[PDB]
């Protein structure tokens with residue numbers, strides 16, 4: 754369940770525009786994709802909701818935002834992760850929200866974990882071939898490379914699961 758040459762071709766321009774980074778030495782990047790057999794805007798409605806990432810993020814326990822919270826670039830959230838993980842909390846600034854083009858992204862700017870300078874971008878993309886509408890989501894990130902330990906593996910495993918749960922959650926709401 755990875756993207757076909759055609760989906761790849763269609764998404765080539767989105768990758769160039771939102772998922773291409775100028776790396777700092779000592780940093781790395783990753784790109785993940787997820788087909789979702791559901792409508793784009795449904796997917797998009799969950800992805801944009803920067804105050805409720807628990808809706809589709811596997812390992813989030815709770816997420817609080819400030820009083821009278823309004824969703825704008827520069828606003829933060831404090832995420833608490835579930836028990837038994839090697840992280841407790843994360844605090845995150847929304848770096849992008851384009852409802853027109855369906856692009857968000859955020860940076861992890863503190864918390865009790867070991868990701869250093871993590872920033873990701875998430876984009877939702879509509880597909881159609883004779884009466885079948887479906888969605889592909891792309892998510893990329895940049896982080897610092899890490900004696901101990903193993904932040905890339907953590908990041909890849911977490912985004913992959915979140916993308917699988919996103920799909921599961923949105924395909925249900927397509928009820």
Ligand SMILES: CCCCCCSC1=C(C)[C@](O)(/C=C/C(C)=C\C(=O)O)C(C)(C)CC1=O
Pocket residue numbers: 810812813834838839840841842843861866867868873907908909910911912915
């Ligand atoms: C080793 C089994 C995979 C679990 C390790 C991931 S625990 C974890 C989790 C679940 C995180 O939310 C990571 C989230 C990430 C990388 C992406 C995202 O949430 O979109 C942080 C608290 C920010 C960093 C972190 O360490």
